[PDB]
Amino acid sequence: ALPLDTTWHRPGWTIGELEAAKAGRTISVVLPALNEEATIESVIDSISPLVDGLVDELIVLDSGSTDDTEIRAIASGARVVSREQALPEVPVRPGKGEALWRSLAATSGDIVVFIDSDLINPHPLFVPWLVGPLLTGEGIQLVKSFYRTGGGRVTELVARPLLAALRPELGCVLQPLSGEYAASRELLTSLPFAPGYGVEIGLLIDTFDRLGLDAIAQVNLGVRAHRNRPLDELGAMSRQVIATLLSRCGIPDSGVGLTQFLYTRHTWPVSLVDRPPMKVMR
Amino acid sequence: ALPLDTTWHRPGWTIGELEAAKAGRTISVVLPALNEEATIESVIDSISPLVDGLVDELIVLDSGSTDDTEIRAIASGARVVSREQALPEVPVRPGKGEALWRSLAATSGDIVVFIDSDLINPHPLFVPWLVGPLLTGEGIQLVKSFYRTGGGRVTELVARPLLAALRPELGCVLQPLSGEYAASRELLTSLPFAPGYGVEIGLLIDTFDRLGLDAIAQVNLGVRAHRNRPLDELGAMSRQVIATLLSRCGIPDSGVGLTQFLYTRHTWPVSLVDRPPMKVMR
Ligand SMILES: O=c1ccn([C@@H]2O[C@H](COP(=O)(O)OP(=O)(O)O[C@H]3O[C@H](CO)[C@@H](O)[C@H](O)[C@H]3O)[C@@H](O)[C@H]2O)c(=O)[nH]1
Ligand SMILES: O=c1ccn([C@@H]2O[C@H](COP(=O)(O)OP(=O)(O)O[C@H]3O[C@H](CO)[C@@H](O)[C@H](O)[C@H]3O)[C@@H](O)[C@H]2O)c(=O)[nH]1
Ligand SMILES: [Mn+2]
Numbered sequence A, B: 001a002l003p004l005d006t007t008w009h010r011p012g013w014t015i016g017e018l019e020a021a022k023a024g025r026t027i028s029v030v031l032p033a034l035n036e037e038a039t040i041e042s043v044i045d046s047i048s049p050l051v052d053g054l055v056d057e058l059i060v061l062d063s064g065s066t067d068d069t070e071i072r073a074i075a076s077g078a079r080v081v082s083r084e085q086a087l088p089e090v091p092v093r094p095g096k097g098e099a100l101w102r103s104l105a106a107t108s109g110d111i112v113v114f115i116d117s118d119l120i121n122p123h124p125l126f127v128p129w130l131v132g133p134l135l136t137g138e139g140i141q142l143v144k145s146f147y148r149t150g151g152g153r154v155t156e157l158v159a160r161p162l163l164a165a166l167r168p169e170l171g172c173v174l175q176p177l178s179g180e181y182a183a184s185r186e187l188l189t190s191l192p193f194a195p196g197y198g199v200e201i202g203l204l205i206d207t208f209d210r211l212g213l214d215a216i217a218q219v220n221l222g223v224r225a226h227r228n229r230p231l232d233e234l235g236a237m238s239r240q241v242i243a244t245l246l247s248r249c250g251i252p253d254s255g256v257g258l259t260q261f262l263y264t265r266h267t268w269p270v271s272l273v274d275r276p277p278m279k280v281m282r
C-alpha cells in the first residue's frame, strides 16, 4: 500500500528460480569490514554456499583492520581485498563510503550486493531476498532492506525525520540507512559516493532524484542485530549523515565538525568531499 | 575557554548575595506540566522555599493534565494556571511551546526561569544557579543549563550535529535543548515561540541571531535525571526540533509529519506555526 514496491512478507522465490532469472547477469557480494573479527566468519559462512551458483563473486573489502579480520575471513574461503588493492592508483581515504566505492573496482557483477560484516547471525536468505526485485521485477535498480540496543537511533531520530522535512517522497522507506542492499552496477558506477557514514543516505537520494521511486524496492529481512555503538560514536555518524543529506538537498553545510564535551572536548572529522561516479575512472 | 560565559563549577554566590543583586528586578519561576503527578511535588518543593525571597513568583503552567498533577501541585502550595487562564482571549493549541509562551502572560517577573516538572530529585540550587549570570554579569539575557536512559539522544544526535552544520557558532552550547533555563522578560516577550518541542532550539537561535553569544551564558547544574521516553516519541520530537531549526536558518520545511512503521503505520503532527512575540498582545 506504499508508492514503493514493498515486499512485507517472506519472498516466495526459490534459489533455483532466482538463479534461472539471472539471464546472463552476474551477482557480486561485498562485505565491507573494519575490525570485525568476532562476526566476520558467521557472515561469510551464511553466504558462501551460494557461490558458483546464485552468487558469482564474494569479497571482503578490508577497510584497514588491525585485528584478525583478514586471517579469519581468508580461513572462511573468502577473497579479501584491501582498499589499496581495490584501486591502487588512488590513495586511500578513511570511512565506509571509501570502501564501498572502491569495492566497485574489485568486482565485475552486473548486480552488487552489500552486507555489513558486523551482523549477529545473519540469515542465509539475506542475499536471495535482496536480489529478488532486481531479477524478477522491471525498472528496479536499487533494493533496500528493512527489519527489527538500540532501534536504529540515528535512523529514527535523524535520517527519517530529516527526509520527512526535505524529501518527503522518501518517507515510505523504512530503513534508509540500512547497510544491507543491492543495486545494478550501471546505477552504482553512475552515482557519486558520499564519505564515511553518509554513503547510504547519499545513494538513496541520488537514486530517487535521478530515477524516481519506481526504480526503488524494499524487502523485509526479518530481524537484524549488530554492534550497538555508544551514543558519542553515533553523534559523529549522524553529523556525516546530515552533511551528506543537506548537500543532496542543495543546502550549504558549514563543513565544521561536531565537538563533544564528555568535562573534556573532542572534535570529530566530517567530510564534504564525495567520490565521483566510478565511470570517470575507466 | 569557550566564546561563551561558561560556569563549569559550582557557582560561588549565596542566596543572600544573589537576592541583594536583584536591585528591584523581580524573578518568576514557571513549571510547565503535562501529566507529571509522580514528580511535580518534589520539583515544587525544591523551589518553594525561595518564594518571597529570591523568587517572587512560582507557577505551574498545567498544559491540560488528566492525572492528579493539579491537585498534587496545589497541595504543595503552588498557584496552578491552565493554558486557558493564562491567556483566555486566544484558543489553546497543543504542545510545550504553547505552554511556555502563555506562561509569559500569567507572570510579571523581570526575569523568568523555566524548570521541567518531570525532573527526578532536582537540586534546590537549580534556580539560584541559573539567575546567577543574569544578576551579576552584564549583557546576559539568556542562561542555559548543562549536565549529566538516555544521554540526551535527541540532543546528541540531532540538535548538536545540526547546529554544527548550520549555526556552528552555537557549537559550544552543551545542552541546547535543556528545559532548565532563565531569561529576561524583555528578551522573552520580543521573541516568537516555536510550537511543541521546538521551543528551546528556537529561543536559543533567535537569541543568538539577535544579540550574539555575549548575551548567552551557560551553567553546570551537575546531574539531571528525568523520564526517558521511548524512541518513537523522540522521533516525533526530533521532527519538530528539525522543522524549527531549519526555518530559523532560512530553509523551507515540507511541513510533512514523520510517519513510523511499528508492522503498523502512524503519522505524528508537526507544526510550522510559531506564536508571535508576546509584545504584540499588549
Ligand atoms: O570506516 C569504516 C567504518 C565501517 N566500516 C564497515 O561498515 C559496516 C557498518 O559500519 P558500522 O560501524 O557497524 O555502522 P552502523 O553503526 O551499524 O550504522 C548503520 O547506519 C550507517 C549509516 O548509513 C551505515 O553506514 C551502516 O551500514 C549501518 O549498519 C561494518 O561492516 C564496518 O566494518 C568500514 O568498512 N569502514
Ligand atoms: O505538550 C506538552 C509537552 C510537555 N510538557 C512539559 O514540558 C516538560 C518537558 O517535556 P518532556 O516530555 O519531558 O521533554 P523531554 O523528553 O525531557 O525533552 C527535552 O528536550 C526537549 C526539546 O527541546 C525540551 O522541550 C524538554 O524541555 C527537554 O527536557 C515536562 O515538564 C512536560 O510536562 C508540556 O507542558 N506540554
Ligand atoms: Mn553496525
Ligand SMILES: [Mn+2]
Pocket (backbone or CB within 6 Å): B116, B118, B226, B227
Ligand atoms: Mn523530560
